[PDB]
Structures are given as C-alpha cells and as structure tokens.
Design a protein around this ligand. Structure first.
Ligand SMILES: N#CSc1cnn2c(NCc3ccncc3)cc(-c3cccc(Cl)c3Cl)nc12
Length: 290
C-alpha cells in the first residue's frame, strides 16, 4: 500500500471503502478497493485474466498484513449518478441502446468463461467521456459472497435480484445477470427503478405484480423451489406497453426476453446482441460534467 497515495474516498462498497489513488511511482490514477482464505486469493487471481473493454480492468491484487487491496482502472462516473443527472430529460434512446449493447458484450464475454457478476446495479456500471460503459466488481460476489449489509451496515439493494435467487435456487447461473441488466434497461428508459423492493418478499411481490405470479405454465419447476409458497397471492401480468412507455416494440420485445421468469428461457447475452433492437445501434458521446 505504501506504493499508493490516497487522493480521496469515492465511496463505501459492499466489501470495504473505495478510494481514488495515485501510484506513487508510475503516476497512474487508479481505484483502490479495500476488502485471506486461499479460496478467495485464487478466485480473484483468475479475474486478472478476464480482460475485456467493457469490464473494469483489475490491475493488481495486494495481500499484506492479512489485508487485501484490489487495484482497478479508474472511471470518473457511474450510471446511477448519470441517470440522476439526466432525470429532467432522460438519457437519449441512442445512448441507452449503446450502453445496453456494450454491457451485453461484457456479459457475453464473462459468461463465455462461466463467470457471473451476480450483483449488477447502476452503482457498479461505470462510464467515461468516450461513450464507453463498463461492468465493475465482476466476480467479487463468488469470491467474497454477497452480504445483506455492507461493511458499513448499508443495505445491499435487492432491486436487481433475479427471481430464482429470491426463490432460494442454490445453483442459479448467468441468467441472473441478464435479469439485472433488463431491470437497469427499464430504469434508464422510464427514469424510475422497475422493482424497488425493500425486503425479499416486497421484491418478489413487486416482480409478481408486474410480470404476474409465476406458475408451472410459465416456469416449470417453480412451485418446487425452496422459498416458493403456494400461499403467494396470484397477480395478473401487465402489458409491457404499460411498464416501459414509450419504449418501442423492438425494445419491449427485448426487455420481455431479458425478464422471462424461467432462467433457461431467458435470453442469453450473445442472443440479445443479435436482437433487432440493435440493428441501428451507434456509439454517442454522453455529456459528462466532471
Ligand atoms: N470498486 C471498484 S473499481 C472502480 C473504478 N472506478 N470506480 C468508481 N468510479 C465512479 C466514481 C464514483 C464516485 N466518485 C468518483 C468516481 C466507482 C466504484 C464503486 C464505488 C462504490 C460502490 C461501487 Cl458498487 C463501485 Cl463499483 N468503483 C470503481
């Protein structure tokens, strides 16, 4: 750590404080995350090889005095702040489309290597002046797990959690990230969180109220999931036309596939990239005020 000079604290992550820092040597500006079980060391070490333009680069891993520091590429802003800043007029569709496309590219890459994010949310989607967007903290969940509360006791958001996780599925897979990204896509379009649950049951019920209570017809095997209860209220499904107006038919079709209840039926990142919604994708420059 003596090799770095802390510039400023940029936030409190799930596992620890996040700092903007400067390599006292190379002069490189980086993000320093303060987080050891050999299991974690090896898993994190594998992440250093998982490189892609839409994944925040993990530069180095520092284990000292039984402490763990992850050194990452630094990005100036996250999607949460950007969305808050674009609240008045909303993010232009072409930019939404570009961001979704890039994020799907990142997902396609990680998933192809059987690596899941598991905790996608606007806070960990980082952007730059060049119009790029990248997934941050990829793989840390499997490495350190996902706590209910952060090291600061802050509540970990459930808003983007897939239903199979909420229902107690132990071996969920890559489809969980597609669900999360679908929720984020909807949020960018509407300027409001899709399912802002404040408890596991409230999260589940919010999903049910919109997409309908899942049954054996739409999701074979659902009634057998660990946390499924026959006593769940039975709500009818809403038209996406009512959910994400005024997203066009192509966008609504794509969103519907990313939000399929059955994880096996949910669209993959790779297939999503081929959806007609991206026929006219471009790469606009966002207006960032740093
Ligand atoms: N970690 C890492 S690598 C990382 C690299 N940049 N970065 C940013 N940059 C955007 C930024 C935000 C505020 N001030 C300056 C820059 C935020 C977080 C982060 C901070 C808090 C929570 C979460 Cl979820 C994340 Cl992702 N992590 C990172």
């Amino acid at each position: 750590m003596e090799n770095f000079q802390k510039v400023e604290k940029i936030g409190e992550g799930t596992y620890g404080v996040v700092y903007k820092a400067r390599n006292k040597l190379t002069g490189e500006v980086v993000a320093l995350k303060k987080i050891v079980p050999s299991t974690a060391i090896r898993e994190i070490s594998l992440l250093k090889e998982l490189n892609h333009p839409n994944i925040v680069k993990l530069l180095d891993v520092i284990h000292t005095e039984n402490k763990l520091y992850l050194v990452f590429e630094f990005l100036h802003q996250d999607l949460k702040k950007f969305m808050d800043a674009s609240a008045l007029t909303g993010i232009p569709l072409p930019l939404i489309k570009s961001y979704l496309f890039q994020l799907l590219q990142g997902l396609a890459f990680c998933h192809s290597h059987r690596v899941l994010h598991r905790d996608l949310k606007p806070q960990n989607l980082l952007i730059n002046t060049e119009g790029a967007i990248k997934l941050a903290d990829f793989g840390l969940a499997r490495a350190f797990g996902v706590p209910v509360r952060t090291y600061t006791h802050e509540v970990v958001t459930l808003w983007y959690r897939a239903p199979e996780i909420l229902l107690g599925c132990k071996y969920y897979s890559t489809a969980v990230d597609i669900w999360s990204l679908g929720c984020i896509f909807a949020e960018m379009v509407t300027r409001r969180a899709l399912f802002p649950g404040d408890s596991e049951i409230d999260q589940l019920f919010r999903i049910f109220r919109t997409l309908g209570t899942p049954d054996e017809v739409v999701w074979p095997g659902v009634t057998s999931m660990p946390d499924y209860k026959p006593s769940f209220p039975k709500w009818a499904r809403q038209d996406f036309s009512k959910v994400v107006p005024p997203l066009d038919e192509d966008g609504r079709s794509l969103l519907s596939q990313m939000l399929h209840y059955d994880p096996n039926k949910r669209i993959s990142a790779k297939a999503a990239l081929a959806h007609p919604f991206f026929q006219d994708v471009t790469k606009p420059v966002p207006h960032l005020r740093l």
